[PDB]
Amino acid sequence: YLAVTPDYVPPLHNSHAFFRELDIEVFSILHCGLVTKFILVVQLGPPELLFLLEDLSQKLESMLTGFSHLQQRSAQEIVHCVFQLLTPMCNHLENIHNYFQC
């Protein structure tokens, strides 16, 4: 329904401005490992994981190197909390590495 309308502004350039902000706490769901379909719990899939990584990347490139809730937090706090999520992230990286080498 977006494509047919030329423009519409109800309260990819408007992806983050129009949508409601997401807090840092949501990324805790990353602890569940991904399950791919073709190669073969609720099994967090590829596309939602891409969505999470997209939002986290758009947070980081704004903070470290619009947003309201993210910018009223300490930079040291943000770095520490991102570090906190390092160990369930490298497992995803290793798993997709094995996906591609497969």
Swiss-Prot record:
Subcellular location field: Nucleus
Known tissue expression: Highly expressed in germinal center cells of the spleen, tonsil, and reactive lymph nodes, and in the proliferating basal layer of squamous epithelium of tonsil, esophagus, oropharynx, larynx and cervix. Expressed in cytotrophoblastic cells of the placenta and exocrine cells of the pancreas (at protein level). Highly expressed in testis, where expression is restricted to maturing spermatocytes.
Taxonomic superkingdom: Eukaryota
Reported modifications of this chain: Deubiquitinated by USP1 as cells enter G2/M, or once DNA repair is completed. Monoubiquitination requires the joint intervention of the FANC core complex, including FANCA, FANCB, FANCC, FANCE, FANCF, FANCG, and FANCM, and proteins involved in cell cycle checkpoints and DNA repair, including RPA1, ATR, CHEK1 and BRCA1, and is mediated by FANCL/PHF9. Monoubiquitination prevents DNA release from the FANCI-FANCD2 complex.
Function summary: Required for maintenance of chromosomal stability. Promotes accurate and efficient pairing of homologs during meiosis. Involved in the repair of DNA double-strand breaks, both by homologous recombination and single-strand annealing. The FANCI-FANCD2 complex binds and scans double-stranded DNA (dsDNA) for DNA damage; this complex stalls at DNA junctions between double-stranded DNA and single-stranded DNA. May participate in S phase and G2 phase checkpoint activation upon DNA damage.
UniProt similarity note: Belongs to the Fanconi anemia protein FANCD2 family.
Disease per UniProt entry: Fanconi anemia complementation group D2: A disorder affecting all bone marrow elements and resulting in anemia, leukopenia and thrombopenia. It is associated with cardiac, renal and limb malformations, dermal pigmentary changes, and a predisposition to the development of malignancies. At the cellular level it is associated with hypersensitivity to DNA-damaging agents, chromosomal instability (increased chromosome breakage) and defective DNA repair.
Record text about domains: The C-terminal 24 residues of isoform 2 are required for its function.
Complexes and interactors: Homodimer; cannot be ubiquitinated and does not bind DNA. Part of a FANCI-FANCD2 heterodimeric complex that binds and scans dsDNA for DNA damage. Interacts directly with FANCE and FANCI. Interacts with USP1 and MEN1. The ubiquitinated form specifically interacts with BRCA1 and BLM. Both the nonubiquitinated and the monoubiquitinated forms interact with BRCA2; this interaction is mediated by phosphorylated FANCG and the complex also includes XCCR3. The ubiquitinated form specifically interacts with MTMR15/FAN1 (via UBZ-type zinc finger), leading to recruit MTMR15/FAN1 to sites of DNA damage.
Name of this chain's protein: Fanconi anemia group D2 protein
Provenance organism: Homo sapiens
Lineage of the species this protein comes from: Eukaryota, Metazoa, Chordata, Craniata, Vertebrata
Gene that this sequence comes from: FANCD2
Residue range from the parent sequence: 829 to 1036 of 1451
